[PDB]
């Protein structure tokens with residue numbers, strides 16, 4: 001109920017996101033890409049790590065509006081299974097996947113990874129991990145390990161914080177201030193969320209039996225992403241307030257400007273972590 005109060009219509013998000021409605025870090029490689037092109041570049045950055053071969057099945061955990069799954073089918077000629085908890089995203093994904101000219105299997109399930117136990121070749125998860133909760137991390141990596149073959153690979157892209165000990169080292173004043181903003185994100189933007197640390201993402205993966213190379217930082221790309229999101233929301237103030245309220249407009253400008261600030265101050269990061277099964281190709 002208190003959390004439900006923070007429910008926001010998809011129409012609001014459309015007033016600050018690119019036409020694909022991607023609600024995650026873009027990849028500005030090369031630097032001159034538009035937000036929309038950078039969102040396709042981020043999908044490619046993830047898929048290009050997964051050693052995907054024709055006829056494999058890719059699981060997308062938190063499949064959004066289906067952009068990742070569509071690009072995987074079109075680029076790699078693979079079957080796809082998407083998991084989402086959003087009825088609207090589910091509806092859109094079925095139609096996105098049905099639209100694709102292919103013989104490959106395309107499936108979208110209105111459920112979480114907890115209830116998913118089908119064999120898959122590869123797994124991608126782009127900024128859903130912040131919504132799982134710390135106590136679920138061992139079950140998540142065990143599930144992911146067990147449903148993949150000997151050459152399995154997974155990418156998880158997640159916003160991350162630092163252990164309070166690490167935060168204290170970079171200024172106490174800045175340490176408490178960051179913790180408070182994180183509390184705001186996890187209360188008002190992603191209610192019930194939890195930012196993991198990169199160390200947590202890595203060590204939970206290793207405990208489950210994965211090889212974990214050095215994670216890729218997307219920090220500078222998230223700064224560019226949040227700058228464009230904030231500037232776009234600000235340019236649509238009138239329409240955003242009209243579609244929601246002044247409260248919600250102020251909340252999301254605080255979020256977007258705030259994240260840009262703490263990413264620039266290197267008190268937040270965004271990690272793309274690769275998880276390799278022992279039999280993964282070299």
Ligand SMILES: Oc1cccnc1Br
Pocket residue numbers: 061062063083084085111112113114128131132
């Ligand atoms: O299973 C979950 C949990 C949270 C967010 N998305 C998914 Br799919």
